[PDB]
Amino acid sequence: STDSIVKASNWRLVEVGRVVLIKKGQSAGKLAAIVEIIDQKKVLIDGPKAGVPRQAINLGQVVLTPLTFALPRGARTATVSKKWAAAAVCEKWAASSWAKKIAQRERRAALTDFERFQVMVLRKQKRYTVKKALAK
Amino acid sequence: FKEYQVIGRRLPTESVPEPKLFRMRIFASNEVIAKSRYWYFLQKLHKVKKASGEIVSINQINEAHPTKVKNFGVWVRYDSRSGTHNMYKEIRDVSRVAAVETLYQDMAARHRARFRSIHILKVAEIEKTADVKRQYVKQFLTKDLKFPLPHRVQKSTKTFSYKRPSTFY
Amino acid sequence: AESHRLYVKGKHLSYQRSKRVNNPNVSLIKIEGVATPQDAQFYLGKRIAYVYRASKEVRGSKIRVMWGKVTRTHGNSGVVRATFRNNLPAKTFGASVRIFLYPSN
Amino acid sequence: SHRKYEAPRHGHLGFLPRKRAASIRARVKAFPKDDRSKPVALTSFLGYKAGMTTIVRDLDRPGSKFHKREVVEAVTVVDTPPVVVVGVVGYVETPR
Amino acid sequence: VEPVVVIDGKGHLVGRLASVVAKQLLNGQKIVVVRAEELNISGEFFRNKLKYHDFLRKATAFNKTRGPFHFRAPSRIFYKALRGMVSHKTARGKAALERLKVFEGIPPPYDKKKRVVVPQALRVLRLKPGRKYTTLGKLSTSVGWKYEDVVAKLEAKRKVSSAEYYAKKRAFTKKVASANATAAESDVAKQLAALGY
Amino acid sequence: MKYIQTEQQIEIPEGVTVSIKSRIVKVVGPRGTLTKNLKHIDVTFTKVNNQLIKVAVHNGDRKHVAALRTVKSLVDNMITGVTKGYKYKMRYVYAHFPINVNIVEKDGAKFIEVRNFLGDKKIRNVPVRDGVTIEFSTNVKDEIVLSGNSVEDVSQNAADLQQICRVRNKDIRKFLDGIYVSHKGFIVEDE
RNA sequence: UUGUUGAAAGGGAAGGGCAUUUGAUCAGACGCCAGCAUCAGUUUUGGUGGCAGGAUAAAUCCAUAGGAAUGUAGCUUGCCUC
RNA sequence: AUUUUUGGUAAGCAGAACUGGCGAUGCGGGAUGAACCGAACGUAGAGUUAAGGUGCCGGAAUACACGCUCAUCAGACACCA
RNA sequence: UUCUUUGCUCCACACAAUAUAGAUGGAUACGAAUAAGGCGUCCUUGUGGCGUCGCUGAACCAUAGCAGGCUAGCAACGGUGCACUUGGCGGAAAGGCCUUGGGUGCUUGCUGGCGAAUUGCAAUGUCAUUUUGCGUGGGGAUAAAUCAUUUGUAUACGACUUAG
Q1: In 10 A of CB F64, how many CB atoms?
Q2: CB distance A42 to A58 below 8 Å
Q3: Does strand G come within 7 Å of the CB of C64?
Q4: Per the database entry, which stretches of residues form a coiled coil (chain E)?
Q5: DSSP assignment of B18-65, as one string?
Q6: C-alpha distance across the termini of chain B, in Å
Q7: Closest nucleotide to C76: CA versus each C1'
Q8: Is the CB of C21 under 7 A from strand I?
Q9: What angle do CA C23, C26, C28 make, to 5 degrees?
Q10: Of A112, E19, E50, F174, which has the maximum CB count within 10 A?
Q11: On the CB side of E114, how many CA atoms lie within 13 Å of its CA?
């Protein structure tokens, strides 16, 4: 060929820098960066800007994120907060397809009954133009 | 679990003033246990029982730095079915208490040794690396460590799914 | 236009029972789209009705109605306990009931 | 205790129940394996049992004691007047 | 939620699925299971073969008819495993099992209906990667079931025709997604992206 | 211990290709093409240099990391199978009755007929697996050389030929008769 | 114990208990069945506010002293596309 | 029947000591069981629990957490098989 | 299946019943893997490059009007029913999928104009899906079995096989 070929398997590595969305807990949908892994199943995470305390947490309650940033290992809350704000983690997260789908769920949950009648009207106004386009 | 300082003295009977105040570092889920264990251990070392002595102080001890990752080298003794055996295990955790309850779980899992059949001889934090004996701890003490989590099993809150759920991460 | 719904779809699972013995006074109702006792506590005190069709016109219509109210939550997984004015007949284990949004909040 | 002197069972346990074959026809339950190369032809053939007679024939069985010797064999005859084709059934293979 | 649920029985654990389906039927939800010949059991082929042969040998001595009938089909192996988890002797149980149908492969009407899964009874979601499992397609035939490759023919035909259908549906949904994307940057689209829809 | 991570290095020679997708190792080389699907093991391959490929196991075990080194072995055996290939020499060992072995054809299938093994009237038929070539080698009396690419093709052909000529109902230590694999090696000379 | 008529039920018995549905039926002619509000007794489930104590938490945080490694930037020697 | 205990290889055997039980006792649990566990009972409502459990049968988490185990005769709750 | 006409059936209506394992917006169609893919894009068409996506369906589609009345239009050249035609495709239980042109209705894409009370402060407040014989008014077709008799390939009696 002779560029051989391997797939390969792309994964989210459990490292120092890996920001992780907390899914079950008092936090439940806040970002926190991993500073030091304990043992294969347990991590150390601090989200100083999001406001989750530096805690040793089980891995069933975290979701690994595609986003990373160069943090030194076991760096304290002040060092984390500076390296976090430097790399701009919160912007890279808010500008995600996933963060948008979380913001869509919480918004459509926080919708009113009048705004439910409005969105219904507008979707049918949109639907008139798209069905004219689907015909041609 | 909790770690408790327990200082019990002995009953002050005149002709014996100032008994020698014996301190312990009992691992217990509350004070009523921490003080019962204190007496249990000091009945194995000295001729004194809860009647012949008194607890002068009980104080919960917290972690000096409860967010620093620590290699806890714990020495333990346990009654097996056949005899008794002295063990050395190495827990890696963030608190002395969290490391100890992991030992109690991994002693119960690996040798069927229940709470009554275990003595915690010592729980000493290992100062400098290259003193870590056990490989299952020396694994996580490698420069610039990373590792994936293959076969990510997400869990539904509803009986039926429509997508054929994936196990990617 | 298509929809006319002003109740939630309940289903009569079973009675309040032991492993063997049953209590036909408290009927266990599963509400559509509820998960926990916290989610279920919206529906505490609501008016559940069981609408069924007989063959005899009684007093205008062949449809008859057995009235009840939600008493409290049941289990960990969002089931409720309902008491009906007359107890349910038990042949309706898996029959739908209507959870109205009566006494409101 | 056991039979004391053990003998093999009376009767085959395969030809049960020993009831009256519902029909009077014979009911061919298996046909050959259906070769798709060679020309089309009938597999089985209906007919009527007439009776039994004796035959005599020479015997080509090398190694046999009666090699090249007249042997009497019983024979049964079946009347097979030409059978008239009157239909054709199509059968689809199904999970039943 | 639906009037009738349709479950693709492929890559599913027999007992776990059977428990899920058994509760649905008692709660009064009409369910059909299809592709019952791609069900799975924990443990190697041989273990479940021996478990079956231990079941085969269980017959009424004095008349082997009226004894426990050993049904060989993967659909009927599931039915046995599900009828175990319902009080079939009671009128509620008879009515509960009446709400169920099980098929070896996806026949008519269900051939062009939407097929769900039950994540808490998927082999892929449940069994530890490294453990060995059974396929009810191989087990069922080794114990008596004759129609292994009749169903393989009929599935291979249905999957050719359903691949053609999908290739047409997807080719179309490209046009629908493109026209919906060219509906954005409109007064209506910005008002909808404000309300969240 | 459950080994956090362990990997094995697989070297790739100078004119061979390695095509891996989801677990189907397809090696191409001067000899030809070898395929082998390893969908039973649960490992991960990664091309680093186009000449080294790292195979890996995450959160391993005693029984798990054993297989990781096994799959390195099977994949190196495939690369060997396309680069150099395999060649098993078997000797006829007979005491009295000379073994009559030749390759005959039955409906174009390549069999090995074994007749007059301990004066046995039977004609033993060893079907030659495709990709395996048989040579009744001269220069060594009573030798047969099974060469080709895949070791499992060559080795099982040689083994199935040895197994059919096992003497029955005798002292197998006096009746030391049958066709035995003397040598297992590679086709290419200068070795 | 039996006949007929009338009514009902019935997959290896039937009969019984608690509960309701359905069909038939029938006293209470002088009452029947509800909804809401504010209360009392009982009790389940939240949501928030004010205090107490401990190593007057331990922490984090800030100051400061010393130190080390899984040694940061530089420093240096090697392969050299600089 | 737990504990002490005699005879006896032993016994769902024979005979003692203290206590508690069945007899004379329903009820919840151990699938079933006189004796085990929990609790002793007028007729009802409501609330809360015991022992025991909460995949499905079956009311109740296919709960959470750390480990162990793969068995071509797995293992699975005391008295108790 | 009758011609004593009045009986059988298929379709349409109205009618008197009869129920309900339990409608109350929609059962919304790739297969295969899961230590892997989906979709879009490119073209040395591959076990290929480059994007992107997942982390639940909390989605998607439907989604207003007497339980949906009557009317004036503006904007589209659409969407969506009821009955009819075009070519087809489906045999695993295909009894359903498409797909033509047409017609005839509606349209909440958008501005209008009337109506609704008194179900009295809630009472399912009745609208679905079957089993139907009952008269209407149209199409269509115009038999068998059993016993008694007979046979013996069969037979305790039934049954079986024959015959007229």
Answers
A1: 19
A2: yes
A3: yes
A4: none
A5: S---EEEEEEESSHHHHHHHHHHHHTTTSS--TTT--EEEEEEE--SS
A6: 34
A7: H61
A8: no
A9: 105
A10: E19
A11: 10
The candidate with the shortest Cα–Cα distance to F13, out of F101, F75, F90, is F75
Adjacent-strand bridge partners of F147: F87, F133
Look at residues B2, B91, B66 and name the one whose alpha carbon lies nearest to residue A54.
Answer: B66
Q: Report CA(E85)–C1'(G16) in Å, whole number.
A: 30
The spacing between the Cα labelled CA in C5 and the C1' in I134, in angstroms, equals 38
| Phi, psi for E163 (deg, rounded to 5) | -70, -40
* CA distance linking residue C22 with residue C8, whole number of Å: 26
- In angstroms, rounded to a whole number, what is the distance separating the alpha carbons of residues F182 and F144? 10
C-alpha span between C50 and C65 (Å, rounded):
6
The distance of E55 to chain B (nearest Cα, Å) reads: 31
Each residue of E151-162: b (16+ CB within 10 Å) or e? beebbeebeeee
**DSSP line for E55-91:** HHT---TT-TTTSPP---SHHHHHHHHHHTTTTTTSH
A8 Cβ under 8 Å from any chain F Cβ = yes
Distance from CA of E14 to the nearest CA of F (A): 22
Give the C-alpha separation, B148 to A64, whole Å.
Answer: 10
Binding-site residues on chain D for chain E (CB distance < 8 A): 93-96
Q: Is the CB of E131 under 7 A from strand H?
A: yes
Whole-number Å distance between alpha carbons of A89 and A86: 8
Interatomic CA distance for residues B25 and B34, integer angstroms: 9
Beta partners for residue F5, in sequence order? F58
Q: What is the resolution of the experimental data for this entry, in Å?
A: 2.9
* Token duo for residue C58: 């009684």
The total number of residues written for chain C in this structure? 105
- Within chain B, residue ranges assigned H as helices are 31-42, 96-110, 135-138
Residue C95 and residue E28: Cβ atoms within 8 Å? Answer: yes
Q: Which residues from 22-41 of C have any strand I atom under 7 Å from their CB?
A: none
The residue type of F37 is: N
Nearest one of C24, C52, C51, C39 to C79, comparing CA atoms? C39
The answer to whether E27 contacts C94, with C-beta atoms less than 8 Å apart, is: yes
Is E27's CB within 8 Å of C95's CB?
no
Angle at B98 between CA B95 and CA B99, to 5 degrees: 85
- Protein CA B151 to sugar C1' I132 (Å): 59
Residue B147 in contact with partner chain F when CB distance is under 8 A: yes
Q: Provide the CA E88 to C1' H25 distance, Å, integer.
A: 36
C-alpha closest to that of E86 among E41, E20, E34, E3: E20
Experimental method: cryo-EM
Within a 10 A sphere around the Cβ of F167, how many other Cβ atoms?
A: 15
Which residues have CB under 8 Å from B11's CB, separation 6+? B19, B52, B53, B54
Instruction: Please report, as a single letter, which amino acid is at residue B151.
Output: H
Residue F83 structure tokens: 């680069």
Give the tokens for residue F106: 């039955």
Phi, psi of A87 (to 5 degrees): -70, -25
Contacting residues 101-130/B vs strand H (CB within 7 A):
102, 105-106, 108-110
Q: Pick from E114, E118, E125: which is nearest to B159 by CB?
A: E118
Flag if F64 and E130 touch (Cβ within 8 Å). yes
- For residue F191 the two structure tokens come to 């070795």
Please state, in angstroms and rounded to a whole number, the distance separating the CA atoms of residues F121 and E175.
Answer: 75
Select the residue from E8, E124, E166 to test the B interface by mutation, using most B Cβ atoms within 10 A.
E124
